[PDB]
Amino acid sequence: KTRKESYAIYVYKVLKQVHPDTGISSKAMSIMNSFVNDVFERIAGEASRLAHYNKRSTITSREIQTAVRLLLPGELAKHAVSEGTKAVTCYTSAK
Template sequence: MPPKISGKAAKKAGKVQKNISKSDKKKKRMSKAMSIMNSFVHDIYKRIAAETSRLAHYNKKLTITSREIQTAVRLLLPGELAKHAVSEGTKAVTKYTSSDDHNNMKGGKRLFSEPENV
């Protein structure tokens, strides 16, 4: 015969179950929100890449530079949002180039050697 559960214990168990189900609902909501944001970022990235490629092609350039990317962002994003995006992008590139990561170092050796002057 299973032990009897007192009224307080049953009440606590009910509250715990209710909190767990609230937590599950919150996790599902957050997961859905993250999925939507991921789709949004992926879509914007694809649009910027396509526009950047078009700009390079129009200008008969084989290399995509930060200039083409900035122009694509300015064309695709409205007003103030474009200004902030370009500003943050420039800041990120500056931070990266001032770090050691941009030297392509691995185990103390460069992965790509500098071209030799002949």
Template sequence: MPPKAAQKTPQTGGKAPAGKAPAEKKEAGKKTAAPSGEKKKRTKTRKETYSSYIYKVLKQVHPDTGISNRAMSILNSFVNDIFERVATEASKLAAYNKKSTISSREIQTSVRLILPGELAKHAVSEGTKAVTKYSSSTK
């Protein structure tokens, strides 16, 4: 008797149910050992996104508003882009000052260099507030 094909779960057309965050990818990219004669199953590689965090912030600001998968993808790309820019600039600043560690000072300076005017001021104040809150909770 031939081996049975793996059953697939039905998809919902790429849309998340109303009122719920888009599901993130499951399982790390591992190959499972199979008995002799059968093909190995490949699981999907895990894709880490900021979707759940973006969704939580959206619900804090506008509890009755939803977000499409495309808009979520755009916001996720935006967060990744800003993160990469800040990290690159902070790395350059640390190298200029001959330091091997990126501290909050390098992050703050890189944010001031990358973001324009008022946006940089708000980002720095929110970042400082977050670091202060974290420091007080760990003591």
């Protein structure tokens, strides 16, 4: 009787968007949870070292963007930059 937060239901929603007629077991859900935490900590640490190198005190979307370009390889990086910019535009225009 104590709470432990994870990413299970969100991975389940993304799976029901791409393949509407399949499921996932518990072990593969544990693997996907570990993958999301791994990539989160890697991008966040890179953005923090950028903000420390430039003598500033704020992590912004430009730091997150440059961390994505340094961390991911080419075509994957271009599609990730496109998706993030589209989300930030749709968030500010729907203020």
